[PDB]
Amino acid sequence: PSQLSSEDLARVPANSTSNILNKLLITYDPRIRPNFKGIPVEDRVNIFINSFGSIQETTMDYRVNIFLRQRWNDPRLRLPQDFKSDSLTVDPKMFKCLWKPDLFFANEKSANFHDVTQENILLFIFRNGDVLISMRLSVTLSCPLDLTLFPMDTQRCKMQLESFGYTTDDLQFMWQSGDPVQMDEIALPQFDIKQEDIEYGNCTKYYAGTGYYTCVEVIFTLRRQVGFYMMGVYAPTLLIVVLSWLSFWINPDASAARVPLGILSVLSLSSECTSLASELPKVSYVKAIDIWLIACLLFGFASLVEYAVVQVMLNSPAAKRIDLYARALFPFSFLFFNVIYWSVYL
Amino acid sequence: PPSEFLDKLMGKVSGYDARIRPNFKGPPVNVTCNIFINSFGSIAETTMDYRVNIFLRQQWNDPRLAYSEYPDDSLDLDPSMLDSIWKPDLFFANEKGANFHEVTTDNKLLRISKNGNVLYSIRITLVLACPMDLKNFPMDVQTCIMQLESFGYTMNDLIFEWDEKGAVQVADGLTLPQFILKEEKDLRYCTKHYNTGKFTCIEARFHLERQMGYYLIQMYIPSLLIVILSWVSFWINMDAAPARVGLGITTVLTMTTQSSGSRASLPKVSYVKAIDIWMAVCLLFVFSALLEYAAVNFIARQHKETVEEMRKLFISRAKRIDTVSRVAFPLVFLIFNIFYWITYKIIRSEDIHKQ
Amino acid sequence: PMPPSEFLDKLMGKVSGYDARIRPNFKGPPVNVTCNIFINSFGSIAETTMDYRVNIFLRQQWNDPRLAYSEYPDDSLDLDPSMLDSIWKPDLFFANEKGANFHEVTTDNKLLRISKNGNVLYSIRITLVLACPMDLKNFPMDVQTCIMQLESFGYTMNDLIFEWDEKGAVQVADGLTLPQFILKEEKDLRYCTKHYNTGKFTCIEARFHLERQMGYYLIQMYIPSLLIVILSWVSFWINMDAAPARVGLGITTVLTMTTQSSGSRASLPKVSYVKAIDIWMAVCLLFVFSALLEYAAVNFIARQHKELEMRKLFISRAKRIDTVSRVAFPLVFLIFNIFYWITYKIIRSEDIHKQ
Amino acid sequence: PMPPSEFLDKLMGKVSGYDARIRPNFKGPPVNVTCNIFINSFGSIAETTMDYRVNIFLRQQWNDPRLAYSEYPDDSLDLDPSMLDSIWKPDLFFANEKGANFHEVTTDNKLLRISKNGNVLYSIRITLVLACPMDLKNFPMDVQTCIMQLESFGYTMNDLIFEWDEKGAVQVADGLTLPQFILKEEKDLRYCTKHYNTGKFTCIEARFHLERQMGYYLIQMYIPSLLIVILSWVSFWINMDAAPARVGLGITTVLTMTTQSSGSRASLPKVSYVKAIDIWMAVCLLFVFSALLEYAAVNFIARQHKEVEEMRKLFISRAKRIDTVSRVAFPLVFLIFNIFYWITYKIIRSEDIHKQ
Amino acid sequence: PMPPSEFLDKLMGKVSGYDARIRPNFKGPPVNVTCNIFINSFGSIAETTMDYRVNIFLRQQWNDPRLAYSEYPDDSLDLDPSMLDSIWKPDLFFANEKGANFHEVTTDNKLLRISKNGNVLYSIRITLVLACPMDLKNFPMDVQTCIMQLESFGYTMNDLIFEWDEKGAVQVADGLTLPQFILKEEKDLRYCTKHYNTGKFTCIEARFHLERQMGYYLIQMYIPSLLIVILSWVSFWINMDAAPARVGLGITTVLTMTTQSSGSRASLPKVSYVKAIDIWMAVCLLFVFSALLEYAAVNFIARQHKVEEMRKLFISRAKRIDTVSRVAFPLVFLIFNIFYWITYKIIRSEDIHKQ
Ligand SMILES: CC[C@H](C)[C@H]1O[C@]2(CC[C@@H]1C)C[C@@H]1C[C@@H](C/C=C(\C)[C@@H](O[C@H]3C[C@H](OC)[C@@H](O[C@H]4C[C@H](OC)[C@@H](O)[C@H](C)O4)[C@H](C)O3)[C@@H](C)/C=C/C=C3\CO[C@@H]4[C@H](O)C(C)=C[C@@H](C(=O)O1)[C@]34O)O2
Ligand SMILES: CC[C@H](C)[C@H]1O[C@]2(CC[C@@H]1C)C[C@@H]1C[C@@H](C/C=C(\C)[C@@H](O[C@H]3C[C@H](OC)[C@@H](O[C@H]4C[C@H](OC)[C@@H](O)[C@H](C)O4)[C@H](C)O3)[C@@H](C)/C=C/C=C3\CO[C@@H]4[C@H](O)C(C)=C[C@@H](C(=O)O1)[C@]34O)O2
Ligand SMILES: CC[C@H](C)[C@H]1O[C@]2(CC[C@@H]1C)C[C@@H]1C[C@@H](C/C=C(\C)[C@@H](O[C@H]3C[C@H](OC)[C@@H](O[C@H]4C[C@H](OC)[C@@H](O)[C@H](C)O4)[C@H](C)O3)[C@@H](C)/C=C/C=C3\CO[C@@H]4[C@H](O)C(C)=C[C@@H](C(=O)O1)[C@]34O)O2
Ligand SMILES: CC[C@H](C)[C@H]1O[C@]2(CC[C@@H]1C)C[C@@H]1C[C@@H](C/C=C(\C)[C@@H](O[C@H]3C[C@H](OC)[C@@H](O[C@H]4C[C@H](OC)[C@@H](O)[C@H](C)O4)[C@H](C)O3)[C@@H](C)/C=C/C=C3\CO[C@@H]4[C@H](O)C(C)=C[C@@H](C(=O)O1)[C@]34O)O2
Ligand SMILES: *[C@@H]1O[C@H](CO)[C@@H](O)[C@H](O)[C@H]1NC(C)=O
């Protein structure tokens, strides 16, 4: 519909989009950009965060639902004072017949539009010629993660909006002056999202043999909640260390009792470490949680090595000094480690 | 004739512009909404979502689509004709992935009355987002949310209303496997404001109650068996250090695996849940079982250090601890159990008042 | 001698005046549609999601007076599948359907045949994932009924009525064999007309009776469970004073039995009722727990002589407890095994009578 | 002498009067279509869902008298892939397909070539998720036959007949070494005509024989099972009166075998017949279980004397002779079992190899 | 001066007589297409499925004589992406591809530029899942070669020939860091022409060399394996007459080690050749297994004594074996460790030579 000035246009209604919009788009070519061979277009961009979530660590991505707003002055699309209203709120189906910038998310993994009952798009045309197109999009963006300091880490995730076909001489993207990213009252399960967003901007890309292209970036600061890992990792490992100390009160001559206590404690901690690796990606650097697990394994290992010394001393022909000292120092040394560890990581 | 009429109602001669809303430059059009729930299921805690199959019906009076020449009222039209008429742009704001069916043909209905009322029913499958409060996790009630908003038309053009009679209808013999869907549904008006303007929205809430049968058989009973197994140690010989220590450690380690397994399904939340209290106390009881033999072993060996009369006192002390423990550990567990189950039923009673 | 291309425009053409929008016999008796299905593949039954997937050929026959030809002397004229776009087709859809799709591997998998009287044959290849509610009171050895519901979305009982074919309504592919189920050769064809707010709609239902095969479950859960029970019994022959060996033996069997029960629930839904497998796993756990429970009594009885000829009687009592146990535990298990299988067999017969 | 555009319109154009809706030789002999298969990619054989994936090129040749030309001297013409929408193309669908898609990576992946005599060569890139029934009676040392059925949905054999090309029906790629299977060179080509109430329809079938590679199962299944059986025999050298050690050794070995057997069934479908792997695991489980019974007997016999000195010595001597014979018999009987198990399955496989 | 819209119509239009069905330079020299690739992201390398995913910009350049323009002074006029249908484009496609899709975020992600000489530049945003056969011997320390094949389905080498661009054929985005792999900067551009029964078709190939980071493998498998070997050595300092203690220690280490070996196969595909992680796991099992036989010999030798001189001799031999084992077992492991790494280091060096 409306292509080539809606063919004959024999119909004669009275002062509707049958007349106004068809008269507006009688000589409109969506293939030719506004202000052809002249000033590059300036496209104001806004985002509204419908839902933020699904920060997956295995694939290092997150999925967001947003509304994309754009604004650009179109000289051809000027209301000829026929309507005293500053807006038209035309049918959403009309987006196909008007020029639109070729915005695309450079870091995106998968995108889909949404068709609940109709196309989820809003088109507005002000009197001066400005156009406001809104669109409902669900985008899966890619976020590189630095998992050092893992249980207690902060992560910056970006969103880059750039053009694919028009260079910086024809099309230019900029962020809206006031409130560019209007978030929603949302809550994340495992993360905390601040209201301070770094509107970095620039990001202008240079590709060899094609030229410069415009880009705009919005960086989101996410802080991880440490509550889950307290109950999940730190408390279980701390418990197993306490069981390891129980051997120091069990009889020195109870070889068949203390030895199972030592070995089953060490092997239980090792299995707990393996389970943690399953969710995390196969990174090659050490994480903060690892220094905790190494020390817990070291204390577990040192309990069994302590008994081996006792068994040598008893059979060497006393050994009660070794056990008595172990009862005091082993909790005491663990206390110092905890003080240094938590203080270092605040 | 039938064929000629359809052209007359909306065709090239008619001049019906599908791009102009009814009552243009005038009062907003009134939209009445119906929902019939054909299927409810796929409630996943991990992703905090649920899936529904519904029939969405909309009614709006269109003055242009008024016919007097055919005597019959509410003549049913062909589904394919729906491209020609103006249809409101409904969408589910809290939705995640929607799909039409088209199993053999478009699952759509169209009816036009003499006065101009339109009825437009479509079959939709929806994956909707439901935020969940996983406190009181085994004994909880969850409110699901379904929001119908207009993306393109403001309050001057498009207003939404709920049907007075039978707004939400549930199919007969619909049984959720893990939940009990209550028969009281709350309908409210929640208008949305953005920087573009005001947009109509209507919301329907479903009150769901979690069935307690599965968790009792599969979580509470297995946990209460390990605690009892620990108590067997209080009858094993005091001198049997390999046996009681072996029995002690096995129970504590097994309980640790069960506690981790319980939290495997539901998400990684940063608050304390009801199941966590139960597992923690169970871990405390089994750990205290391991920590009672250690005190008995130590108190006994102290005789070696009136040497015989020193020997008697220590040996008696050890036995007393074991005998007292045999009745003490079940009794304290019993007192905890009655406190645990009474408070949560009280809290559950408060929750249904909120619902 | 009529040209084929020219004839194909005399019907289903602009010159013809055939309107696919208007149903046959407008303002008159309902259209009679006979339907057949061919079961090309059955499988992908999933307990967790309570659905199954089937690939079928759906044939429909209705009499269109307009599509009557006399120039060609052929009894029937197979036509190109592309022509189906220009003919009125009933809006059949499946009410229990979760997902369905068409097949476009090389061409559209459709078949149209038109007879001289005006009959139409319209065969479509479809694959549907159908929802089946399941009753799991007996997790093995049960009979599950899977239904297929074919109804009209937009045409009421005044316009479109669906009927099953008198002969061969459901035909199954030669040599179809489900891996874990047995499909019965008797299929119940009934009527379930639907009433909604928008009117009454035709619906026809075909149900399939599926019987679970016991071969897999016997060698993978029942025999492993039997091994754990018989392993526990050897403790009665282990030395009475060997506390580390017997206590370690008792606890290990009980904990492994617990894991085996946990393995069973992996593929099952979180149902709140009691299943048949739960009875077996509970009784097996009861036997192994009792064997550990027995040793605690023997240990408590045995040590009494030293703490308290009284020596001989206490020792004698402990040995007799072991001696009776060596025959009591096997015999009592045997009585349970006889009772468990025979009671459920008559239950199986009762469920077989109910189909 | 003729512009290419004009030839494209003069033949099969609206002026020409070629209707793709009517098949060639209407009210006449059946159209004969020759078929070819080039296997671009074979893999993703999944036991659990009993399917496999394949990437193929499907070539069909059929003689159309209407599509004949004399204007151009060339024997053949590589026509544009986009203009296929006005060609009459036979309907071909796969009876055992569980899923398929076209490929649109950059353009339409199709080839059309029209010869002077009217022959048409039409090639398509397809990815097929085909379903094959699998025996699994002998999970190791088995040969599986996969099926590809090419049949017509709308045209009966009086109209459309499908045949197999005389030379090079199925053509495998240069490599295409499957990780878990070995694809035999010989491929069976058969006719399996289908009969329905609608009518009789043509169909052609190609069977592929796949032999499972035994290297993975030996390293990761049989050898771990062998280790536990040997580990059990260590109990026949430990002290006779060391009840915690020997009973602890016996239980840990038996329970480990149960978890090893449980691991194997995970990757397999829930079939209701006894597989070859089941017989191995059962016999190995029988051996390790019998070791536990051996300690039970010697423990009972040793203390039987208490329940004068002459009886005590005889019982202890009786107890010790059990240990001596056990440490020799248990390896030897397992050795004898291994010879019977492997030899029978090889002769069974060899006879099946003749069948396959 | 002359209106922009007319140029769109006057060139490559109905008035122009441009035919997109007919390739440039018909009945003449083959069209030569130069290809560029810009790798936006590289990742998702999966050994199990032997594939990897990539996001690229595919640029093609060819010379169409029919598109020369001299009316406008400017060169390299950007066109609109929506009008690419009427442009003739080569039928490039990927031979080893398993799943590919276009990108439609807001508009089509396509760029078209046309120079005055007729040269055309056409870039597309594509996401590729590409099949990559892998040789998984030397699994922890393995360099992997990935290939990308670009060849023509419908045009033979008489019409369409593909060549790699002289400057910057394969370009990698700045700061692209694979998670577990390292991508070498040297890229192999080869010609692998394809021959079929249909004919000969042009093909160009690009090879990528990927080195596997061994940080993860050392921390999660090698270091835990060291613990089990070391923990086994603790038994050599435990008392000789501690059969429950020492055998229990032996069994726990050996059985835990087997589970650790079974952990590795989870991600690996089922292959029938020996890998390098197998040679490590096999030797580690040998060391712990030989420790169990070490105590078994000591236990057997000690009891062999049953005058007084005999028990002196046998008891010394059992003690001597333990002291020798305390140095022999660590020493032999050190010898194996030195030989293992140096052998696998020289092989890795040759792998770099093989690229
Ligand atoms: C302190 C541990 C020592 C070793 C004792 O541990 C044991 C046994 C005896 C040792 C002396 C077992 C231990 C619990 C303690 C007793 C503890 C409680 C009854 C509660 O716990 C504390 C700890 C908790 O944070 C560890 C703490 O902070 C809160 C702050 C915030 O709320 C205000 C909240 O936002 C944040 C998330 O958490 C809070 C004061 O509540 C009770 C809630 C315990 C829950 C812990 C667990 C349940 O499943 C977990 C895991 O799956 C498993 C394998 C082991 C469990 C465990 O290990 O449970 C487990 O980790 O006793
Ligand atoms: C030395 C290990 C013995 C067995 C000790 O293990 C324990 C306790 C006592 C034993 C004596 C426990 C062990 C850690 C160690 C302490 C180790 C470290 C603090 C680090 O390791 C060193 C050693 C490593 O060289 C083996 C060395 O790299 C070489 C080669 C490199 O070339 C590429 C070269 O760049 C470099 C210069 O030098 C490097 C300095 O990193 C630290 C990175 C290790 C963390 C290990 C673990 C955390 O989670 C893992 C796992 O999920 C689990 C189940 C067990 C953990 C564990 O097993 O923890 C675990 O595997 O102590
Ligand atoms: C009673 C627990 C103590 C610790 C005893 O446990 C053991 C051994 C000895 C201890 C003294 C083992 C224990 C079962 C009990 C014996 C119990 C039964 C034989 C049955 O149960 C009764 C009790 C149950 O009430 C919760 C009772 O209510 C019903 C009411 C309703 O119907 C009218 C029903 O809608 C509602 C949901 O439930 C009902 C009469 O069924 C039998 C069904 C037991 C099932 C339990 C289990 C099977 O697999 C589970 C789990 O996967 C596993 C790892 C351990 C099992 C277990 O732990 O089994 C397990 O949890 O003995
Ligand atoms: C010999 C078994 C006894 C039980 C010994 O086992 C142990 C300990 C002591 C016992 C006396 C442990 C055992 C290995 C052996 C020593 C064996 C080796 C060092 C190698 O093996 C040989 C034998 C093998 O022939 C089956 C032989 O054929 C090849 C021929 C072809 O190559 C030319 C090859 O294409 C074809 C596939 O196979 C070949 C020479 O490789 C080494 C490769 C062993 C690997 C085994 C394993 C690694 O992870 C597996 C598993 O995940 C686990 C839980 C246990 C491991 C194990 O159980 O490892 C495991 O199964 O010692
Ligand atoms: C549009 O035109 C009609 C008559 O053609 C007139 O009545 C109406 O007021 C006009 N609308 C305006 C001027 O906004």
Residue numbers in the entry:
A (entry chain E): 40 to 356, 466 to 494
B (entry chain A): 33 to 337, 395 to 444
C (entry chain B): 31 to 338, 398 to 444
D (entry chain C): 31 to 337, 396 to 444
E (entry chain D): 31 to 336, 396 to 444
What does the paper behind this entry write?
To further explore conformational heterogeneity within αβGlyR, an additional structure was solved in the presence of 1 mM glycine and 20 μM ivermectin (αβGlyR-Gly-Ivm at 2.98 Å). There is clear ivermectin density at the β/α interface face, but there is a difference in the ivermectin pose compared to other interfaces. The larger side chain of βI333 forces ivermectin away from the primary subunit. The αβGlyR-Gly-Ivm pore conformation is similar to αβGlyR-Gly but has a distinct desensitization gate. P-2’ of αΑ is moved up and towards the pore axis. We thus conclude that αβGlyR-Gly-Ivm is also in a desensitized conformation.
Glycine receptors (GlyRs) are chloride-conducting, pentameric ligand-gated ion channels (pLGIC) primarily found in spinal cord neurons where they mediate fast inhibitory neurotransmission. The majority of adult GlyRs are composed of α1 and β subunits. Here we report three structures of full-length zebrafish (ZF) heteromeric GlyR composed of α1 and βΒ subunits absent of any exogenous fiduciary markers.
